[PDB]
Amino acid sequence: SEQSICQARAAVMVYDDANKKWVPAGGSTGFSRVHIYHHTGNNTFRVVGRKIQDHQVVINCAIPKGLKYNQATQTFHQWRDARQVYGLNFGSKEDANVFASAMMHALEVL
């Protein structure tokens, strides 16, 4: 039904507008496995991530047809939806590159 086109290691943060603080998505510090999933029937994409130790879902966010994906640093990327700002702090420069090009691909095919 739906395919994982990439798997990077990153710390998923969401932004706390109230306090100008980046907070760990899910409330708990640590790395997660972050996927970009492709629903082959619908041609729709979403970012899904489960923390490495707990297998708790810390992020599950649709990728819309025009998402502005900002690569702030070579290891920190961020994008915005109607509610939050999501950040991925990747474990490696390479993790970020493959995730970034899967994201850039997903936006071209949407």
């Binding site: 943060m13 980046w22 907070v23 760990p24 510090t29 640093t73 961020q78 702090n89």
Partner: peptide
């Protein structure tokens, strides 16, 4: 865009 996080934040 918020600034990237302090390494103390992560």
């Amino acid at each position: 865009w918020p600034p990237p996080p302090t390494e103390d934040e992560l």
